[model samples]
Every structure is written in structure tokens, then in C-alpha cells.
Target: MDFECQFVCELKELAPVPALLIRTQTAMSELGSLFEAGYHDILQLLAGQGKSPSGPPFARYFGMSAGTFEVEFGFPVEGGVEGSGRVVTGLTPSGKAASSLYIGPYGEIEAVYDALMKWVDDNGFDLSGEAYEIYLDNPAETAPDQLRTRVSLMLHESLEHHHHHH
Candidate 1:
């Protein structure tokens, strides 16, 4: 089956530097304090510097490699900052796409990956690009019972090519 492509727009707050990818569970359990500390610290810096009202301070005082994670919500637009404090800057061609929705603790997201891969194989689509997760609700602000996450895989229509390996 041939898969059609789509695009996604985002205002990515990219890490000024690269960060090591840690498993989501590991990052959640072992690094909870780090994430909270970074969040509050950034707010404090922003408040102190009078930039909080304009945008997040985005200070580099944490003294460690900045972790790159995204909070994806709403469709992307050209230029606007949403109430969530993320600035909508640009659109990314989602390329080809396959997606699934998951309802549960954010920690259970690995299941979504497994299911997405299964769909990819079943539909004869080759996965492309880095896997990404979009949190429909912020866990920090919402009760776990009310939280939702959407896992998406960008796919390419090349899996049907005849190739074999031993």
C-alpha cells in the first residue's frame, strides 16, 4: 500500500547543544529532580531578569548539557506563541506519517512505539526520521488520570522494495 505524506509545524526549543538520549522511564524516574530543578531554575532566572513575561529566560546556568525534549500541542502555525508558553515558529514536513494514541501514565509510552512499528510493517511502510512523542496534556500540571500522549512515526513508502539479507 502506498502511504501519503503530511507536514507538522512547530516552534522547537532546541537545545543549544546536543544531549544524550536517555530512556523515557529512566529520565522520568531517575531524573525527575533534575527536570524540576531546571524548570524552576529557569523560571527564577527569567523572573529575576525580567524576561519571564516576554519569554522563558532560557538561561544556561544548569551547567550540564541541556536536554532536548518537546511539548507538542496544537497544529503548527507560522508565528505565534501559545498560552502554553511555546512559540510557534515553523512547520516541518511530517514527511509520511503513521500515528497512534495512548492513554495512561506517560511512562508507558514504549508500548506506543511497539504498536507503531507493528503498523509500519503491516502497512508496508519504512520508518523515517527520529521517533517523536506529543503530550496532549502536561503531566506537571494535570493529574495522571487526565493525561494523554500521542506517539507518531513518520513513514516512507519504500518498504516494499525487494531486498533480502542473510
Candidate 2:
């Protein structure tokens, strides 16, 4: 897994989606089935509402802990949409973030995270919000080894405050 971390900016917006919160322990065994069912459901709802996906599908991890992270999987929409049971409206935070592109099998994605963390630490940046992974290629259409996923971790303000001594 090869990657380079860079500073990037993202505009904030409301995202209408169908998401699921799964424990990391069970995600491996549960994500595939859950994603398949939720993906279609969300797409159908969006189509019924006469809306199109504004961007690629993404999975957001709420916290640094992979053990019990909240995964919000969905597409960004042009505007807000009504939530229908499992399908709900969420917000995408806008700000500076550390981003990297991982091109390889999903199984090896952990390496990209490791690279990003090291880059952030080495560069002296504090994490602010949840991290997200934007799927750039469809797994069904492309080979696992050729897939591309953009990983982003929102950055907090400078760490100067933490180092200041009164």
C-alpha cells in the first residue's frame, strides 16, 4: 500500500444517506451483507426523490477507535432530503484535512491509515473530526488490486497551544 499525505480542503454540506453503525469486531463478517442491502435501498430512495449522487460513496469512521466505530456509508446529495427510517440526513464537516490515495486491495487499506497517522504525527498536526474513505472505483467493475480509495482525516488547529507553558 503506497500513499502520500497532503493538505486538502473540503466544503461543508448536508449528506442524505442510509448508514449503519457496526463494531469493528463484526464489520468483517457483517459489512458486506449490510452494505449490499443498504446501498440499494439508499439508491432507490434517492432515485425516487429525483436526486442524483453528488459524489462518490463514502464511509465515515466517527472515532479513532476501530474497535467500535460508527460507519456512515452513503453518497453526498445536492441538497437535504427527508429521512426514511434507515435512510437519514447527515452533515459532512468542511475544513482542512490530511488526505491520501490508496490504490490496492481493501484488505491492505490498514497500511494507508498507518502511513497517514505517521505523516500527521511527523508533521505535527492534531486530528479534529471523523475520518472518511471515498470509494473511487466500483469493486464489482474493477479488480480488487486495482481499486482506488481516497482517505481523509480532518485536522484540528495548530498544536501550538498544547506546547505553550504559562
Candidate 3:
């Protein structure tokens, strides 16, 4: 999975996205299928409720240790949509965040991740360890080499900026 591993990342202020989502745990062994089913289920729930997805689907990840990943996946929804069962109404993280638009194979995203981390550190910002992704292109239709994944990492909150030497 080697290509021109160049990524352009930036720091941006992000707004919270309201979504109808499902929280679940996954591993590399079942990652693909999990999203397939979770997304399928959510779309069904939205249809049954007569609600509509406002934007591309997103997944927020918390912990990834020992091959187990805790994730929340769903589609953005406007007001009037509600949650049922494992699907809940939630907001993706807000405030200052580091983001990058990666256009390539999903399996080659590690290169983008590496560049994002470096870009953050180089600019004196620390990540809050919360990583999220908004998938822009659908795999079923989009070319495998042209997948679009908007990756975002929340910036660490700190009081350092308020300090002043008097």
C-alpha cells in the first residue's frame, strides 16, 4: 500500500454535528462488516421514523487497544429526529480540531494519520485522543483508489494560553 504518502492537514474550528448514531466495539477482524450492518440498521431506523440524514455518515473512535476499537457510527440528522434502541441522538465533538481531507485507499490512511499527528505537534497543539472520521464517498460506488475520508482529531484543552508573565 505504498504511494505518494503526502497529506495536507490543517487546524480548524469545528461545529458539533447532530446525528442518529449507534455505539459499538469492533476489531480489525470485523470492522468492515460492523460498519456495513450498523449503517444499514441506522438507515432503516431513519426510514421507519420518516427522518432524513443531513450529511455524510461519521464514526467517532475512542479507544483502540489490543485490536479492539470502541466506536460510535451514524449519519448526521436534522432536528425532529430521535433515537431508538442502540441508536441514540448525539453530537460529534466540537471546538478546535485538526482536520485533513484524505483521498485514497482506506487501507493507506495510516500515512495521513501520521502526517496529521506531526502537523499537530509541529504547531504546538496536542490531540485530545479523540479521533473521528466523516466518510464523503460511498465505497459501493466510488472507485477504491478515490475514497474520500475527512479525518478530524480534537485538540487538547489547556490553560496555557491564558498564562501571562507579569
Candidate 4:
């Protein structure tokens, strides 16, 4: 239940192979299946090309809305990989970020985000980009209560200026 938020100098670089872009409301029902399918799709593609996943799988969120949101799920890969179709290449934003680790069920992840956002605001860090989740444990292998996820949000450069000016 406890979480810590700190400024990360650099986040791991990722070459995301977009797997899905669906509404958040429907995510609960479709996320697991879509992720599994996408993971396999990416793995198969990479294997055919003599490549493999360089890191854990991740989900990138964009165009958030009450009614809809786009979520792209994929794994990190080294260098460039061609997009055969919906599996297009994407980049994870680097540089400053407010980061924290959540060790619990995915349903409870919102708490981690709340903590991170509060820390960022309280410390004068302005969010600069979309947030993403780096999944560290497999649901099929690990219990829901034992799942691990790293939540991160890019920070705007203006934070440094605010520090100097204040």
C-alpha cells in the first residue's frame, strides 16, 4: 500500500510494437486477451527476424477520455523493427520522470498513479508526456497480489527553471 516517488534521471529505452488501441472502459474485459495475443504476435515477429524481447512488456496510454482511451501494448526490442501492420514501432519517452513501483493487483494501480502525481505536484515537477506501465511480473505465473508494475511520468524541463527561479 505504501509507495515512493522520486525523480528518475533516465528511463529505459523501449521499442514498442503497438498491439491494441481500445477504449479504457473496455480495457478491463479485453486487456488480458489482447496483451497475450499481442505479446505472441511481437515475439513471433521478432523470432522470424532473429530478434527477441529486450525487456518486459509495457502499455502506453494516449488520448485519455471518460468514454474512451487508446492503449498500446508491446515489448521492448533492440534497434529498429519493421511494422508489418497494426504492430507499428513506437518509442518510450526518456529523460526526467516521476516514478514509483506498485506491488499489487492491477485494479489497485490507480493508487500508485495518485501517489506519483501528488509527489510531482508537491515537488513542483510538471508532467511533460504520457504515462506508461512497465509490467514486471506475469499474471499467469504470479498471483494478482504479487504483481509488480513500474509507473512513470515524464517531467517537463520547466521544473528545473521553477527551482532556480523560486
Clashing pairs in 1: 7-94, 9-91
Candidate 2 residue lDDT tens string, 34-57: 667755666445667787676677
Model 4 is weakest, by summed lDDT over 10 consecutive residues, at 157-166
Query: 46-157 in candidate 4: lDDT tens per residue?
Result: 6687876667777765543223446677566665665555565555544456666666665545445555555555566665565567777577577877776777654433
What C-alpha lDDT do the candidate models reach, one value each?
A: 0.37, 0.57, 0.67, 0.54
lDDT value for candidate 4?
0.54
Candidate 1 positional error at 155, Å:
4.2
Model 3, residue 24: distance off in Å is 1.8
Error of 4 at 1 (Å): 18
Q: What order do candidates take by lDDT, descending?
A: 3, 2, 4, 1
lDDT of 1 at 103: 55
Model 4 regions more than 4 Å off? 1-33, 104-107, 137-147, 154-166
The TM-scores of all predictions, comma-separated, are 0.41, 0.65, 0.75, 0.62
Worst 10 residues of 1 by lDDT: 56-65
Superior by TM-score: candidate 1 or candidate 3 = 3
Candidate 2, residue 140: lDDT: 57
Instruction: State the TM-score for model 1.
Output: 0.41
| Residue-level error in angstroms, candidate 1, position 128 | 3.5
Runs in model 3 lying further than 4 Å from the true structure: 1-6, 64-66, 140-146, 154-166
